[PDB]
Ligand binder design. Sequence first.
Ligand SMILES: C=CC1=C(C)/C(=C/c2[nH]c(/C=C3N=C(/C=C4\NC(=O)C(C)=C4C=C)C(C)=C\3CCC(=O)O)c(CCC(=O)O)c2C)NC1=O
Lengths: 172, 172, 172, 172, 172, 172, 162, 162, 162, 162, 162, 162
Amino acid sequence: MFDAFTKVVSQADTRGEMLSTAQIDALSQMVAESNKRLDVVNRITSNASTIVSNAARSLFAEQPQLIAPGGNAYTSTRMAACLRDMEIILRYVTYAVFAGDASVLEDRCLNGLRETYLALGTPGSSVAVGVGKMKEAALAIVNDPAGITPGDCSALASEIASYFDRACAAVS
Amino acid sequence: MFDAFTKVVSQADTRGEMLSTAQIDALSQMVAESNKRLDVVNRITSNASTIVSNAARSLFAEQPQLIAPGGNAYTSTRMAACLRDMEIILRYVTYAVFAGDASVLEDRCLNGLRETYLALGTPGSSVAVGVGKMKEAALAIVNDPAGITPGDCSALASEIASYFDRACAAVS
Amino acid sequence: MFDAFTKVVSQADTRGEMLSTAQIDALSQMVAESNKRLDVVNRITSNASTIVSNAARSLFAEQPQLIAPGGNAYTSTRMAACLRDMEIILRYVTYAVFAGDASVLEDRCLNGLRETYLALGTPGSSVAVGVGKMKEAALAIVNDPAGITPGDCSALASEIASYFDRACAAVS
Amino acid sequence: MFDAFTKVVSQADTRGEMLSTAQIDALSQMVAESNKRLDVVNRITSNASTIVSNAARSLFAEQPQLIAPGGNAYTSTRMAACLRDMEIILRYVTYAVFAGDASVLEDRCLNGLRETYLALGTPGSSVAVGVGKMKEAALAIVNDPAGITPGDCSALASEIASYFDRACAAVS
Amino acid sequence: MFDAFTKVVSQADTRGEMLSTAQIDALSQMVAESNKRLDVVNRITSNASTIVSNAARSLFAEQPQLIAPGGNAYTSTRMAACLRDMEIILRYVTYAVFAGDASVLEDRCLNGLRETYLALGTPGSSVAVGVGKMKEAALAIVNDPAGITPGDCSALASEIASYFDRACAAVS
Amino acid sequence: MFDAFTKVVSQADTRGEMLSTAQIDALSQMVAESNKRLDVVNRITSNASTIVSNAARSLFAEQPQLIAPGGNAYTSTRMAACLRDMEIILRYVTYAVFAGDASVLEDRCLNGLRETYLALGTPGSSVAVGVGKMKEAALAIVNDPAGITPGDCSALASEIASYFDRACAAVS
Amino acid sequence: MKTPLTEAVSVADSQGRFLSSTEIQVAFGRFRQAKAGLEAAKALTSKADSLISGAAQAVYNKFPYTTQMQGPNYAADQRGKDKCARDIGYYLRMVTYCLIAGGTGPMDEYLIAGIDEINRTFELSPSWYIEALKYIKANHGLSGDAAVEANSYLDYAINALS
Amino acid sequence: MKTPLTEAVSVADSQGRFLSSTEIQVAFGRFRQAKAGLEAAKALTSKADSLISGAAQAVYNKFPYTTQMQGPNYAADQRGKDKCARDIGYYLRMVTYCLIAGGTGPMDEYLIAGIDEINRTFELSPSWYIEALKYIKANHGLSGDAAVEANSYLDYAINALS
Amino acid sequence: MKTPLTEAVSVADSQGRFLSSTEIQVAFGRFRQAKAGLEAAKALTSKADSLISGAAQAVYNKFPYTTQMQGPNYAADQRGKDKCARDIGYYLRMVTYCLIAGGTGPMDEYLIAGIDEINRTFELSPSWYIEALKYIKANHGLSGDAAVEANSYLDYAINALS
Amino acid sequence: MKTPLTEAVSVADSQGRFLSSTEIQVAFGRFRQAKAGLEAAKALTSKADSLISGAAQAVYNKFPYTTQMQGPNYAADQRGKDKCARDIGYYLRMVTYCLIAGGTGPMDEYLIAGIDEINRTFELSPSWYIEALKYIKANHGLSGDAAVEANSYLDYAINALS
Amino acid sequence: MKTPLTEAVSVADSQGRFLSSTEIQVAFGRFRQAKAGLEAAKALTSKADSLISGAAQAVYNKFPYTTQMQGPNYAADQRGKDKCARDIGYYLRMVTYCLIAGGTGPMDEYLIAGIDEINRTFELSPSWYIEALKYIKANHGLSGDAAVEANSYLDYAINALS
Amino acid sequence: MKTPLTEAVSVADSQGRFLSSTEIQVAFGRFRQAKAGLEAAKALTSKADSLISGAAQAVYNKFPYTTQMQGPNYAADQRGKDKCARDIGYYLRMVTYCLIAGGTGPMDEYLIAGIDEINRTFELSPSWYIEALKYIKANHGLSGDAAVEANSYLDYAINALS
Ligand SMILES: C=CC1=C(C)/C(=C/c2[nH]c(/C=C3N=C(/C=C4\NC(=O)C(C)=C4C=C)C(C)=C\3CCC(=O)O)c(CCC(=O)O)c2C)NC1=O
């Protein structure tokens, strides 16, 4: 996997180059804003199970066919499985945010997922809706002005939404 | 795997229903005829090795190309393996009978078998002929009137043939 | 795997035949020339690391793109791997020579290799060039008149080139 | 392991004898009273978790040192493990009752246990106290006249007490 | 393990010395007589199963308690195992002879065996009697003048008896 | 394993107490001087191989019997193994220093070691001499005034010496 | 699944053995019990509605807060009451399945496995369901073997939740 | 061992489970079968001597060479005739054990495991024993369940040797 | 255990590596955090009694039934009320330990592992403890980094219980 | 397969090694043995017919019942006598192969592996074949190393069957 | 790879855990170190050409035979002199990479793994490179934390080669 | 160890087999080669001192810097010159052992395993030893099979070091 640094480093290496001082300045900038990154990781994590449970509940109300007997989330093995996936996707999104690079999320979570769902009969579009709701709730928790040093987190919010969107796209 | 009971149960769960009293009566019926079912399992089992050896002998007499040097059942490693498969198919057929449902036979024995033989160069048609022979001998042993309380075992004979027929189909 | 003997045996078995005295005489001939065979194996083996190192060095000089940063043999993991493959192919070549039958080289080394390289991005044509250079150096070392009882090794030289050619073909 | 039958069979075999008809009558007897045995198994089993939890609670009340910080059942890892042992012993006691022979309980549960606890720093005597408590509650459940065909279960109650006692002795 | 060569080598290495020409001449002597060594290996091996079966038979006739119900070789699992041990000892004795050094027999067969038998309840003295019988039959087969170039095999006979003796001592 | 913090925590837990503001104050003190601790870890680490090689060379000079043929460090397998043990001890000492607690060194390295050496024939006293040499060179490297902010590192030197001495004691 | 028939086959298959007198005895066990079991499932089915309301009301009685705390995990509104009756329905339905099959299998598979995660996740209390099951035992009205078998499944659920 | 009671326990123990209705059904199966089984063991025991001689005799009739080839694997002498009766004895005895236990277990463990090595090693022919077993079947004179169960064990030995 | 120092060593050990700049940076991270963390642990310790009562009372307020249902899993008597305070005490004490160590480790080891079994076994509701923890967050009165780190441990217990 | 050449190569390959003096000495051993071995295969081939009938006849003599018991495993009819000679043919042919290759390999692979199952399944007696091999030994008329090596494969078959 | 950020994630992922305070402290470590580290990479980059020649020259000075033995593994011709400077460049470039990433990772992956096989294969002496690295240490002219971290990577390469 | 006799036995043992013609052929190979091999070990032994000095000197000539750089890895003093000859002695001694045992075994075990660590650790150059070995080849003065086998061990050492 890559973090924001080693992503740049690996690209440099295949060119046999040292980083341009422009590149280094970009990284310096990312460093200077890292407190905000870490806050976002802590906040999302600190609400993982309400993020997950709420989105799940909400999804089910919108899509009752999912939990009607016969639906993919009917029976406890399956509901459990379904909740577990929500948590997993959220886990890997937080990883990518912390590392500052989508690779962990791409490689270990999303890659091959669309095919896994197809084979199982799980409706991807539905998962994506789930992911769509977690993303909203997450961002709202990130952006909450209470209890934090006031500043602009909007670039970060934009990045975090990016990672959620990838997850949703990867199962759609 | 399913037995006759859990097969119905699993269908009823996917519909979120309890069994209709019709369905319960059908299962009662199967219970009432269960002594015959157990007799059939016992009798085929108690003759497994003559069922297998006679069918095998017969098959080879019909198809000498199988045991001519060059042929798929030539050499001890292969003859052994070939006899072993006959025994295996017979075993799973008796399982299905005992359980009153094809699933065990389908899932753990026949599924993937055609592909195995294709890859090996084993002539499936020939295995099917062997199965065919085992089926005749089995049924004759099942239907033998001597040494048993007389009754009608015809529906059961029909079911037992069914299972044999599935196996032959699965390699043809 | 087969050696020269068991190759012929295995053929004879699929026909149900004992070997024709023509076939035995062919083997006797191979036995009578076997000291040369063993010399060739010993000689190539005794020079394995210069055979490999010189061919590799040479290859890189002809194909600098391989070791330019970005190239498939750039970075130590990859250079080591690439030298290791060189060594491996030569190892199996000497096996086939010692056994007097290509099977070991075919089965355990070449089969699947084209695909491996394709998947990895390794340029097979390049490997073939390396194999090709090893081949030249091996034969020269085999044919060196110094320090050995003079005789004709040409048939053997022909065989050994055969094996190298197979390896080159198998990745081309 | 042995059940009541095979226990006697194994003993007869090491003497090369068939069972004396005295021996067979003894087994017939045990068969005739088998409904009671099965009730006892069903009854204890159907109350496993109140048998365990109540004993456990009671033990801790008598021995608070066990759940004072520093005591062997302080911390959740430990309390879990402790309750888990209670449940395990109880499970093996029910097995010995169902099979009508102590072997399963001796072989797979008690043997080596004294030594495991010594090594860990778990106070055996305390475990014994817990087993004793489960014993009382078990027997009361077994002997409850409510909801059952009335009859004499005393010999069985004596057997069951035996198994518990063995478990207590084995850690004492 | 050691063979006759590496035994001497290993001893020379712990002294940091090359072999004394006396020590080399000793090994040359062993080399010169090697054809007889190989004959002995072939001949015992070629009769393994009569060597074993005959000794086992004779042992049981001398020691009927062994095969009386209750005795260590009673039941098929046990007789099989007992026969198997006879064959094993014989196998490792032949190894020792072939290698010209006791180490393979010592390390992989005899070491720990006394203790295995003690724990099992197998009467070692008995096994020793069995070994002692295999020894007699083996040597008679070695020393048979028929069908071989006449010569003196006495030193070898002495060595072979040595190995059987070790085995018998190792369980006595 | 414990680090300085969790060692104190675990002790508090077994008493069921929160840390005394005394104990917190002691940890605060350790935190304030932590830059020096990390320098010591870096410094020893950055010289691991000269620390080891120099120590080992010196040991052998003092103790030639170790590398005379027959001696425990004679032969390449053994010399390698001996050098490896030197490196391993030094690695675990640096661990204990970094964690500020002897546990990792005690648990995963020293415990059982005396017995290992006994069984192998390795002279522990010698290993302790080696360790003792490593200790000297390490401390000299730690205490070197060149290239660092001047300050007092004596308490830390005293600690570090402690860990080495434990290792030496553990094999003595 | 855990049912006498499929478990007999499973052991046999896992040992590479044709069935023997042992497995046939199992079958005998199952088929004789089935008489009681089937009858019991029928009876339970025909009392379905009554037993479900009955139980739900029992739970609300033992735990009144559940009919009046705000929040999706309770039954203060219709939504919640429906969920609760649904779940109880599920338990009863499984108990009928177990009776039909002659083993816990169906409940193990469709209900028990992962129940812990759900109740933890959705803040449902096992205590509540235990009451529901207790009520069904006291009020199913079966007798003889039908009663004893049914109860075993009910006590099985209870043990699973405690 | 393969008996209904010990297998019930083993599956439970291997799954870390308390026994349930399934295993109790197994025990039911076993205990009803036991009535026939025990009675059959009784009958076989009391005909022991006759069945054994009769079988031995049957074998010597089908395979006359065995009463007259020299060599330790045959019964041309008293020694051989005694071994042969002994072995047949052993088979019968195991068949009684199986009846008593309700499964092939005792035969699997005392007799079947390693049989192939013995017969190979000592050059005994399975065909001979098969004949002994076929004779027992024809002549035990059991009827009803006793007969069926006893035969299942005799055919089981036969299948094991063929 | 999960603490920056011990995990740095563990990775290194599992990889057979001497420590490098990476692990030194970890220590840097830990030691800088520790200034806040230690102060925080101090503050919580000196408010121990007040936070505990306050929390217990909050749980009793949100869930009044727990102060008046008969039975050992509730706090309708002194015994119960003591247990409940004791448990809350434990949570707080763990949160201090976590601050001191710089990670969840101590809570993971002494409290989190096996929690699920206890609550299931003793019929304690995770909902209750979540309220206790919410109260401690709202009332510990820390600020700055101390507050953020302490809350991360409190929300971590919360996540573990939901 | 088990032959000096392919075993030399296999050890080497499993050790990831180029071949060395050791494996070269193995080839030397094989190549010197081959002079005798090949000549021996030739001689055996040119007596094929005589050795086969001779042997068959030898078996029928030792075991007359085989030429007259009804039933497919015996040689009472032409069919059975053909099968029997065929099988003996196979044993001889394998023995030639082993001489050619210089090891048991061909026999191990084509004949030995699974023989036990065949003889058990089709009720063929190993004793019978052992006699055939004994006869081939007594009558192949080889001498010197040819004889020693050939017998080694004949006794090997014998051992395999006892 | 070995960097603070990716290692943090790896441990977490291998443990199936969301990130906690521990991993956030790691990141803090990394981000504070990054200020020095990045500045250090910049300074080393701007002195690239001078440091590389200087080092090369240092090696040729300590080991003069290298500028005059015939043969491809030496720097007696332009070809060799270029290679040597190329390799020293690689070392420097990796050292910058390490500073950027905050760990040995880039060096481990791109350069260290397999270095032993190269030097053995091409007869390059680790001693030579060690001198280059020593020179770079003496001459990079960094100070403060930038020097300390840079040197840790240079010493790391040195340890790897000795 | 790698020698024809012990490998023969190992393959057999790992296969659970008695030895056969294959393993006997291996021994034949070994025993015939031994005539040459033993005589070669003798001749090497009697030229020991001359060969060792000779080689050490060759090394010092090819690599003059080794007799005059300061530092414990070189031969600029008596101590270093003694070490060097010692080591060459060790290589020669192993070559004799390999001839005696008929394989690389003794060299693999006593010398080759771990050599890479030593030379890395003590900064010894493989190049130097290669020259020693080349010298021994050019000067042992053996002929015929003695020469060819001896050289195979010398080249073997050389391949191990490059
Ligand atoms: C442990 C071994 C064991 C076996 C093998 C066994 C068999 C068995 N077969 C049975 C019945 C029977 N078996 C048959 C069998 C046949 N009817 C046919 O037409 C054909 C020819 C056959 C079988 C296909 C019939 C008709 C009945 C009576 C109907 C019934 O009881 O279901 C019965 C019930 C009682 C009886 O009539 O004796 C048993 C117990 N019981 C055992 O305990």
